[PDB]
Chain A
Amino acid sequence: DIVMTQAPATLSVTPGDRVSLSCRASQSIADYLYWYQQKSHESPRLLLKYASPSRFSGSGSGSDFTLTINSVEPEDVGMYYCQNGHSFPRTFGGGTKLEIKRADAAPTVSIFPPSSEQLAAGGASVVCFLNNFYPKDINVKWKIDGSERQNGVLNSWTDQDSKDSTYSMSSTLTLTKDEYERHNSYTCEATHKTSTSPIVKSFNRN
């Protein structure tokens, strides 16, 4: 069985640069080397046919191949697999995630107290949205009455947007109805590259 190995698995290009993603093979597979682009929530799309949009080009030919993008666009964010179509069983590469550079954008923080429909049904969850920011590195800390809390916090992240090229994140603070009414102040602070002071968004249930 042929093992496809493409390195690196992560690249960060600038809008307008020239990207070159390499794909290596253990055995010689002639030109039967296809390319696929899998975006954020879609199925993979066939890019090139037999190692050869008008911005994607293919070169290389036996064991060493390459996928070139002469001008990267913000819609090029996604995964890129190279498939062996020369011998059975058909095998794919490890993939290479293509992130893109951008201008630093401050996140838009918005905290939401537990809803009445949930408090009237037991349990309380405090959600905190941090949307449209760059870069993706960001720290979020929950504080209840000035005390930092890490227990019972669920975080999820979005992939880089194909049009905005920014990232978004939601942080939910799950407690019990007894523990929620036990306190008063609930803050959702965050420190990012675009912040001289930690961005804080809070609410008082009183």
Chain B
Amino acid sequence: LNIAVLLGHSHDVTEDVNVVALLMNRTDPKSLITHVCDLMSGARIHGLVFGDDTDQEAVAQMLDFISSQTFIPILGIHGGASMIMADKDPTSTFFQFGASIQQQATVMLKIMQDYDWHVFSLVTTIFPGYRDFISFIKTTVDNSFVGWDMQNVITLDTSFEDAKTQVQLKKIHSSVILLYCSKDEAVLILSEARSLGLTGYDFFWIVPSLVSGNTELIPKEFPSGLISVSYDDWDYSLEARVRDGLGILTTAASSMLEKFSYIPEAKASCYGTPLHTLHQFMVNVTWDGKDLSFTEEGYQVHPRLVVIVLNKDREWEKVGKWENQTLSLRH
């Protein structure tokens, strides 16, 4: 019934259903808790649709924590709230509009297959998720046919001295490079690879959405011709994201009208349990053309995956699409 929408100043956005719209550019842990708790007390909210303008992945960590304490369904729509890293707490109702690491690697492998990029090297840090990324593309290459010659994976550590990252980076001897690390670490790795002559057009760097992140904040250390798989598709308008988020909640509310005969009233206050929540009837929702169903881990099943390249004008160019029929449609 009563739903709130929190967004940032990005993408130029200015404003049964009882939507409460607000906009603030403070996304620290205290500001996130304060907004949601002050929204819960003073407005019996049954669901939240959140988005921000930063690359802070820990915002999704805070929203999941708030959702398990307030019992409020929260939908990460844009920014760090939509970055997939930690698995959703089972006792929470926090879901995000994004893809998993294995879903991006399937697209990354599909790109290399269609361009006969069989020989490739692997470059990862000790950042969480690297062993998941290595294990997936290794088993997918070892048994199933998408890569032929994969150089042994190179492990890095951006926190160490440049000399340490430089000595380890020269071991790459392949034209295609899969680079998995944080966006903060990528600024340092790609700025040093440029000094080693490894960011030219005779090399193809493919990075997941953990490196690209926001399609709006592009660091200058990203070399021209950087290939990435991201889900902040600028054509997936922010106006449409909240429409999909609202559609999931309203459908989950009407589907919770009969199995139980009510809608869970908002909690009394954060500052000094329900028999039924909207946890079910929400992970299995179809709205308009595509199904917006989630997984128990938190991420989407059929996400808006897209392939982007960094133009020489310091801009991202959309040259691929995967969301259609589980196939890669290059341009």
A–B contact (CB under 8 angstroms): no
Q: Which residues of A contact B (CB under 8 A)?
A: none
Q: Which residues of B contact A (CB under 8 A)?
A: none
